[PDB]
Design a protein around this ligand. Sequence first.
Ligand SMILES: O=C(COc1ccc(F)cc1)n1cccc1
Length: 211
Amino acid sequence: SMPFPKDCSQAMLNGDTTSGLYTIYLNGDKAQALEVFCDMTSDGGGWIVFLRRKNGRENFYQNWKAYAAGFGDRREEFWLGLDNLNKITAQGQYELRVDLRDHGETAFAVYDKFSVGDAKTRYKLKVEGYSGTAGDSMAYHNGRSFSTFDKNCALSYKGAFWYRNCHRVNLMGRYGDNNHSQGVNWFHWKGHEHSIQFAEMKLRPSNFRNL
Ligand SMILES: O=C(COc1ccc(F)cc1)n1cccc1
C-alpha cells in the first residue's frame, strides 16, 4: 500500500507479515532501492536486520570499505553496511533490537534511540534508552566511531565494531571462538570467554510500538 516503503515497518504495514527479503527505498526515493531482510515476527515485526551470526560460514574480519558497503548473504550471515545504516537512521527516530540465542537460551536488548553518523563521523554510534534481558552492553560503546583493522582493537580481536578499549559487545567477532574477547560476545549476558551461537541486530522506527 506504501509504494516506496523507507524501512521494514512501512513494508509490514503493507500487510507483508512473512520474514524475508523486501525492497526499501531510502528517504522514500524510488532511485534509492535497497534489498533488506525484514524480521516480521520478533516483538511486533517491521525490523530491518543489519547483522546476522548463526554458523560461522561468513568472514567478518573485513576492511573499512567492506563495513561501509556491506557484505554476505542477507538470508544467512551478513552485515548490511554502515552507509545504509547512516541513511536509514537519518530518516527518523529508530530503535535498535539485538536478539541473542546460545544453546537454547535467549536474551534481547532494545535501545529506544539508535543512530549511525555519516563517514565524516566515522559512522559514530548513538545508543540510548536500554531495556531487556541481555544486559546493557552497548552503553560502553555509546558515542564511539566504527573501527576496522585498516582504520588496535579490530586487529587484536580480529573483528570490527564501535570499539573503545576494547569491547563489551563483539557481535562481528570470530565465530565459535571462546578465547577471551575473540568471539561473538555480549559481555553482560555470557562474558568474554563464551562465543554466542546466534546474534541479530535490527532496527525500526522507535514510534512503531504505538503507530
Ligand atoms: O557489497 C554490496 C552488496 O553486498 C552486500 C551484501 C550483503 C549486504 F547485506 C549488504 C551488501 N554492495 C556494495 C555496493 C552496493 C551493494
